[PDB]
Amino acid sequence: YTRVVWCAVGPEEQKKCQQWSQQSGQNVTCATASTTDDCIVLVLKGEADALNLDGGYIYTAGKCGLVPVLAENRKSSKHSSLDCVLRPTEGYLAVAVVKKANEGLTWNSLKDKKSCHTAVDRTAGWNIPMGLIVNQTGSCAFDEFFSQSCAPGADPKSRLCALCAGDDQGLDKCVPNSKEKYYGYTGAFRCLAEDVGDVAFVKNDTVWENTNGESTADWAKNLKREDFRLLCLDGTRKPVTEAQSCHLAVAPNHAVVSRSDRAAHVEQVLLHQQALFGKNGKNCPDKFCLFKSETKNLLFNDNTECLAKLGGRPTYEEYLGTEYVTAIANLKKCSLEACA
Ligand SMILES: *[C@@H]1O[C@H](CO)[C@@H](O[C@@H]2O[C@H](CO)[C@@H](O[C@@H]3O[C@H](CO)[C@@H](O[C@H]4O[C@H](CO)[C@@H](O)[C@H](O)[C@@H]4O)[C@H](O)[C@@H]3O)[C@H](O)[C@H]2NC(C)=O)[C@H](O)[C@H]1NC(C)=O
Ligand SMILES: *[C@@H]1O[C@H](CO)[C@@H](O[C@@H]2O[C@H](CO)[C@@H](O[C@@H]3O[C@H](CO)[C@@H](O)[C@H](O)[C@@H]3O)[C@H](O)[C@H]2NC(C)=O)[C@H](O)[C@H]1NC(C)=O
Ligand SMILES: OC[C@H]1O[C@H](O[C@@]2(CO)O[C@H](CO)[C@@H](O)[C@@H]2O[C@H]2O[C@H](CO)[C@@H](O)[C@H](O)[C@H]2O)[C@H](O)[C@@H](O)[C@H]1O
Ligand SMILES: *[C@@H]1O[C@H](CO)[C@@H](O)[C@H](O)[C@H]1NC(C)=O
């Protein structure tokens, strides 16, 4: 009754959810689906209660009647005396990242290069960069812009999946879940790091969290911030320290959604769950930490400080903001799960 069913995407999220379930004494239990779109359908059916979503999926879920409940909040600078749970969200910066050694590559010479995207339909990985490219090109043929890409969730036989690697056995190539080696923020950054692609569309944080020893992962151990550059819309290249002046957009933070009729109950349970397993929580790091997965961003982003109350009681349109909603609307003209 005051039990919340979380929806995990893929087997690694399922494993994390199971540990949370055990530690929560079954106040939270787990349903699993192979894609984020399927988890949305489970929530619509009432077979799951909630999951945390990137803004592009929130647009999808919102059209079907789902609502944002709490948002990820990461480290701040202003609103300093304010408690994390009450602090306004700031958004994250969507960036385009390349290797310094790939000289003369700029926003203006991206045509026919190789690209690394977090997944189709996601904010930094797809909606913002492809939205910009469509506008600048005056063409809906965004699938013919890059020579080859990894964009998890596209047709595995298309050039949009040519660079995706699948799992350890080479299966599930291009699936939009963490079994795909190049899925998500860390996966697309890895796709650039290994020189599989020429450019990764990720967020500012990703670059910092995976360089200069911040990650102990084999592929990331030796990466240095200085070996990367950001691509600016004016055609210049800048150091990764200049993201505030060289990003493609500011994105709304990922947020937990649920059916409108279940929102209040989901909010109550999660606030108590974070008091236990959140950043300063009673049982973290001793038993279980909700916001940790070893740089893998499972269920929540690893840089999450807390889940924050929204205020204004957002509709999903208000939460995403009018600038962003119109951008997606326009990109989607180029090409129940279409609930509107
Ligand atoms: C781009 O993304 C970067 C990664 O998120 C941002 O850099 C971070 O900036 C925040 C402040 O806004 C720093 O917060 C710190 O929190 C730490 C304690 O919890 C302390 O830093 C210590 O830990 C880091 C790892 O988190 C280590 O590098 C080191 O031990 C350090 O002493 C500080 O007390 C500080 O508040 C954070 O350190 C930065 N992250 C990293 C990993 O460098 C950056 O601002 C973003 N840029 C823009 C323009 O938004
Ligand atoms: C790609 O281009 C499209 C269309 O050229 C962009 O859509 C446009 O976005 C702007 C900014 O949000 C909208 O301007 C707004 O107009 C409304 C009223 O018309 C007003 O409320 C705001 O003050 C603002 O001026 C504009 O309406 C919208 N155009 C259309 C036809 O929908 C889109 O933003 C571009 N994509 C990207 C990723 O930038
Ligand atoms: O960043 C300071 C700024 O944060 C808020 O901005 C957004 C996006 O984070 O918060 C809500 C929730 O997602 C959105 O409605 C706001 O979007 C607007 O502002 C962002 C800049 O952050 C911008 O990219 C969008 O184009 C806007 O639509 C709030 O506006 C406010 O608290 C400020 O403190
Ligand atoms: C389970 O939820 C009930 C209802 O609030 C609460 O009494 C208890 O603290 C919760 N236990 C855990 C481990 O989350």
Ligand SMILES: [Fe+3]
């Ligand atoms: Fe995102």
Ligand SMILES: [Zn+2]
């Ligand atoms: Zn800006």
Ligand SMILES: [Zn+2]
């Ligand atoms: Zn409102």
